[PDB]
Write a protein that binds this ligand. Structure first.
Ligand code: MG
Ligand code: MG
Lengths: 55, 68, 143, 64, 57, 144, 189, 145, 75
RNA sequence: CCGAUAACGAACGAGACUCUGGCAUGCUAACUAGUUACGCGACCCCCGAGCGGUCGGCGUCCCCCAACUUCUUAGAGGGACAAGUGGCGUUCAGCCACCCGAGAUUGAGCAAUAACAGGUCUGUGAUGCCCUUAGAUGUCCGGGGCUGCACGCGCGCUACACUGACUGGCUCAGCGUGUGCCUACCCUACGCCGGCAGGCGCGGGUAACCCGUUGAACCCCAUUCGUGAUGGGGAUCGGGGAUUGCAAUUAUUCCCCAUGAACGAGGAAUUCCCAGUAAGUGCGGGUCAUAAGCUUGCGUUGAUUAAGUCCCUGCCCUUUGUACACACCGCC
């Protein structure tokens, strides 16, 4: 709560630095092509994004 | 194995033979050309499967009656 | 009856050139030649203590075949399999220092030079002697 | 007492047998005497027209 | 351009914009007969046309 | 004996290994990638490279000047692409400038030796599926 | 004329049995300069017969994982093996190859499924295509284990495997195994 | 010139405190010493400036004494410091190479001082476990039972 | 099938035996002669190439994996 | 599907469809792909080749200072349909063989009516209900932990060797990624220092422009080894050094010198698989401050066996039995 230690621990890197841009989860995150998307969320939004399972 | 024609191609071939018997013939390429215009088939793959069956029935009908 | 280095066996050409480098006392060699291995992935130093002449002969014709090749290009060429022990094998590039020393030694012999871009390319005197040894090794081999 | 080994020429393939398709009944007439033809149960791929060895003569082929 | 981003990343970013825009519009106009949306993007401007059943609402 | 503009270019490929043979009028010689066919990397298959020139002899090669550029594939695929490229290039050049009656009397020998010397192999590769290490191989499954 | 490996004409070779004469591809129209041709001989039935038998030998040599695709190695293996037999016998190595296959061809076998309730092993004959396939496989697997833990080279151990089989000296792996298959067919005929 | 075994041949001979074979190649035979690998053998025989195609039983006496002083005093003959065993040692800070049972004495020294200082690594050594952090839940059961 | 104890080098009994019997039979390979003479085989490679330089045998193959020699042609 | 036929005609699913692979010297075009021709060269030559040979050397959109799309890219089209022949078959649906053909079964994607109290509340600002809610099961910080080992099981990788390992030389790919709203994290050529891991300065690249002609491994060519748990094996462990991070001990990873453990083809059992398939063999992506023995792809080398069956194991249909219908995990 005090400012010196509330955010003292850095997260410049690692798995905690990155989160899903739809649900803030940190597991199964796709970082390719700047996606930054939780994978279940990406499977949900793939059609709107433009990804098609041609085969 | 696995060269059995579907009822889709079989039925369509019998229709066009009945409706245009004169314009057809014994040549596959001629048959697929006349089938190109008289009927609206979207697929070339379906198109020449129909013409293949029509050329098969043309040999049958020139030497005997058939179901159609 | 003109002969290019491309028109002889490269196996016999390379050893012929290294013997010429052995005879010509001009090519300088460093003092660690009996000590270090040729690459990261090698389990043992080369059996020929004349490996430096062999390698200088190799990189001589390599710069003949295509120019503009630098140290990283050289370590890529001479790279090889690394067993990785229990891990499955991979590809490890050659050592930089061994290739650099060869390039700077041939530089000192003055039949190779820096390009307008990076890397090094043969001098006209360079391919002059290369086609000279290629012709004579061809004539000896054919008969 | 040992019958001479001879050859038999395949005429037609009867089908498969042995409860797994491993064997194959076949009708064969000897080229020594082309009148006589028996069924022999072969092992392996056999076509029609090719010939095959026979260590005996009297033994025919039953099912399986 | 170095200030610019790669074209592959650009199309991904566009689809990200379209997906998020569609979801936000869905959750905002859920009762207002929301149907769909399209975007036309030009260097001059970007246009958003929302297709719905009750536009007067 | 001096006829210019007398040249063809015929490709040939197998397993993503294209090999374009340039053919033109000239004295009898052969070179791939700037080196003769004899000085090649898989010298155990060096007989297969000189196999086409052995079929119809060097006499039908003495009036021609052919050089090949090769890219792609591996050692075997390059060699096979090269030998079929040579046969296709010579046969097409012969068909272009002189009679096909004598083009046939070498084409028949080529096909009745090996049809791959004139007809490229249609097989390339099969994609990998997510159920096993390879195209059809599947990972080990265990019930206990 | 064709000169497989630069020598060893295939025009003076003969096949003594019509059983395998129509299934061996050593003839002139099946005479190749090298035992290497990716001719798609396994695409459908009864194609492997028309594939040259020396090509089949190199095919049956690459075995047991560490060399399952090294056709170049099996070609130089049969190349040196042809030299070795040609040295110590002098006759046509393709001829001794044909004779070795003929001898090692098992003319009878057991089906092993003769009776449902209890294993019976009904004795049956062997089709020619099985004759060559088993004969070559016995020769190649004999060569495989003849030099597993000794100084002997793969080319040499294959060579004496072929020589003993072709001469019927019964000290060959192929002759022992073929004889064993005959014995059981006699036993349960 | 590929002749018979010489009269001055040792079929088995003693180096330092232990025996090394003679039928083997010189570099690959002196590796039998507890502390020399194939790299060390090659690089000291190269500095010894003698043959490498002859066996260990071809090693005449002056060659024997030549190569043992090399292998006991490597740094004094321009062997690099990074080639050594006890580089920048914990006792004297002095580069050196350990051979024969001298390796076993330095190895024992580290193990007993690790137990003495009661570090985690020494405790694992004492308990007969692994030290490099590798897992033990599934493997290593042969070493215990 | 217990042990081989192959001889690293020649001696009185074997060196003369090699020089008297080797160039007589048809197959002269390092593997064959090492089986016959219980020699090591690295020695066999050195011995055969010295015999080839002595002109008692003729070279057939000269391959990296296997080198094969044969007896001289009688005439 | 064809056929007998109280049925006739349909619809879903299969198919059809989309993508992908092979062929078009057919069309459309390209300095971010190039190819032939030519002008300078550089070297080989010169016995004499001279319209000689090599060049990923330089130029001919440096814009007036060549043509063209064969090779590359990718659009529009075509092309294959059991179409030709022969044989079998009720002579019907089809099957097999062969000529010509690039191709005579390319792989995938999608996928019915329904069922599994199947898995997921730990993907979600999806969610009912319950619990907790200031000494917090909210939330932050620090340390430990998810690794911990008397043992059993599964997926794997490395090997048991000479078809080999080491040393050197020669040497050909294709997928595909590459500088960030948050988010401080990119691929990297060259030159120099270091043996190596690495370090320093200039570059290039938001990309068919640079890395990169992706100089990959396997394989190929020569030397050594020599049947020895041996130069196989690199497990275990000691010492030292670098990179990343705020932090490396319970060792992140990597590099070097050491030691060299079992393992000599594996019981009963058991998995996967039919053509560029298995298998060996590397390389990308995802994970990533650091990183693959995993996974997903890509390419290279490349076969043996079969064109059959219900014997085993499963699954489906028909018949049959039913006191089951919450439907056998039932009723009783
Ligand atoms: Mg479908
Ligand atoms: Mg060590």
């Amino acid at each position: 709560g005090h400012q010196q230690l509330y955010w003292s621990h850095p997260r410049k890197f690692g798995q905690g630095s990155r989160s899903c841009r739809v649900c803030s989860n940190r597991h199964g995150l796709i970082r390719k092509y700047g996606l930054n998307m939780c994978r279940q969320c990406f499977r949900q939004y793939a059609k709107d994004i433009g990804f098609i399972k041609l085969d | 194995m696995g060269r059995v024609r579907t009822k889709t191609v079989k039925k369509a071939a019998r229709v066009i033979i009945e409706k245009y018997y004169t314009r057809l013939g014994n040549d596959f390429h001629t048959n697929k050309r006349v089938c190109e215009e008289i009927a609206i088939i979207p697929s070339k793959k379906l198109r020449n499967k129909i013409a293949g069956y029509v050329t098969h029935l043309m040999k049958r009908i020139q030497r005997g009656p058939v179901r159609g | 009856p003109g002969v290019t280095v491309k028109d002889v066996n490269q196996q016999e050409f390379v050893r012929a050139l290294a013997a010429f480098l052995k005879k010509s006392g001009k090519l300088k060699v460093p003092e660690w030649v009996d000590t270090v291995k040729l690459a990261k992935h090698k389990e043992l130093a080369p059996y020929d203590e004349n490996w430096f002449y062999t390698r200088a002969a190799s990189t001589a014709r390599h710069l003949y075949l295509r120019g503009g090749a630098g140290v990283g290009s050289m370590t890529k060429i001479y790279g090889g399999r690394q067993r990785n022990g229990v891990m499955p094998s991979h590809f490890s590039r050659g050592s930089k220092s061994v290739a650099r020393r060869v390039l700077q030694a041939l530089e000192g012999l003055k039949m190779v030079e820096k390009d307008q871009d990076g890397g090094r390319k043969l001098t006209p005197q360079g391919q002059r002697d290369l086609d000279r040894i290629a012709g004579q090794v061809a004539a000896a081999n054919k008969k | 007492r040992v019958q001479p080994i001879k050859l038999a020429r395949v005429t037609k393939v009867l089908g498969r047998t042995g409860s797994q398709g491993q064997c194959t009944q076949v009708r064969v007439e000897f080229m020594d005497d082309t009148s006589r033809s028996i069924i022999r149960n072969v092992k392996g791929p056999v076509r029609e027209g090719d010939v095959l060895t026979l260590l005996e003569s009297e033994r025919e082929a039953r099912r399986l | 351009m170095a200030v610019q981003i790669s074209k592959k990343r650009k199309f991904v970013a566009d689809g990200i914009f379209k997906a998020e825009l569609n979801e936000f519009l869905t959750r905002e106009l859920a009762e207002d007969g929301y149907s769909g949306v399209e975007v036309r993007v030009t260097p001059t401007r970007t246009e958003i046309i929302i297709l719905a059943t009750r536009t007067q609402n | 004996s001096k006829g210019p503009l007398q040249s063809v270019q015929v490709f040939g490929r197998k397993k993503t290994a294209t090999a374009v043979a340039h053919c033109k009028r000239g004295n009898g010689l052969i070179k791939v990638n700037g080196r003769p066919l004899e000085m090649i990397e898989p010298r155990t298959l060096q007989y297969k490279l000189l196999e086409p020139v052995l079929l119809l002899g060097k006499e039908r090669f003495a009036g021609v000047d052919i050089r090949v550029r090769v890219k792609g594939g591996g050692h075997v695929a390059q060699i096979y692409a090269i030998r079929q490229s040579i046969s296709k290039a010579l046969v097409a050049y012969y068909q272009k400038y002189v009679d096909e009656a004598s083009k046939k009397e070498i084409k028949d020998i080529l096909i009745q030796y090996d049809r791959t010397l004139l007809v490229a192999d249609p097989r390339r590769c099969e994609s990998k599926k997510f159920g096993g290490p390879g195209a059809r191989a599947r990972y080990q499954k265990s019930y206990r | 004329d064709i000169k497989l490996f630069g020598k060893w004409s295939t025009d003076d070779v003969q096949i003594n049995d019509i059983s395998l004469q129509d299934y061996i591809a050593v003839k002139e129209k099946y005479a190749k300069y090298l035992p290497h041709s990716a001719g798609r001989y396994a695409a459908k039935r009864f194609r492997k017969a028309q594939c040259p038998i020396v090509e089949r030998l190199t095919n049956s040599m690459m075995m047991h994982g560490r060399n399952n695709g090294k056709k170049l190695m099996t070609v130089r293996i049969v190349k040196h093996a042809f030299e070795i037999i040609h040295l110590l016998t002098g006759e046509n190595p393709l001829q001794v190859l044909v004779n070795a296959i003929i001898n090692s061809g098992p003319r009878e076998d057991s089906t092993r499924i003769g009776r449902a309730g209890t294993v019976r092993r009904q004795a049956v004959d062997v089709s020619p295509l099985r004759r060559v396939n088993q004969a070559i496989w016995l020769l190649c697997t004999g060569a495989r284990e003849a030099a597993f833990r000794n100084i002997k080279t793969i080319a040499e151990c294959l060579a004496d495997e072929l020589i003993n089989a072709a001469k019927g000296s019964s000290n060959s792996y192929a002759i022992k195994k073929k004889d064993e298959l005959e014995r059981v067919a006699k036993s349960n005929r | 010139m590929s002749l018979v075994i010489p009269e001055k041949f040792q079929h088995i001979l003693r180096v330092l405190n232990t025996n090394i074979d003679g039928r083997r190649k010189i570099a690959f035979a002196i590796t039998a010493i507890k502390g020399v690998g194939r790299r060390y053998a090659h690089v000291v025989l190269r500095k010894a400036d003698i043959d490498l195609t002859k066996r260990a039983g071809e090693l005449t006496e002056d060659e024997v004494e030549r190569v043992i002083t090399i292998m006991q005093n490597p740094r004094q003959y321009k062997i690099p410091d990074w080639f050594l065993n006890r580089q920048k040692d914990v006792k004297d800070g002095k580069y050196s190479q350990v051979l024969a049972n001298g390796l076993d004495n330095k190895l024992r020294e580290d193990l007993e001082r690790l137990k003495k200082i009661r570090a985690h690594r020494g405790l694992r050594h004492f308990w007969g476990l692994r030290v490099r952090g590798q897992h033990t839940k599934t493997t290593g059961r042969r070493g215990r039972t | 099938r217990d042990k081989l104890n192959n001889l690293v080098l020649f001696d009185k009994a074997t060196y003369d035996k090699l020089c008297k019997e080797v160039p007589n039979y048809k197959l002269i390979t390092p593997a064959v002669v090492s089986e016959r003479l219980k020699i090591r085989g690295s020695l066999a490679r050195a011995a055969l190439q010295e015999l080839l330089s002595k002109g008692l045998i003729k070279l057939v193959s000269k391959h990296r994996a296997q080198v094969i020699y044969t007896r001289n042609t009688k005439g």
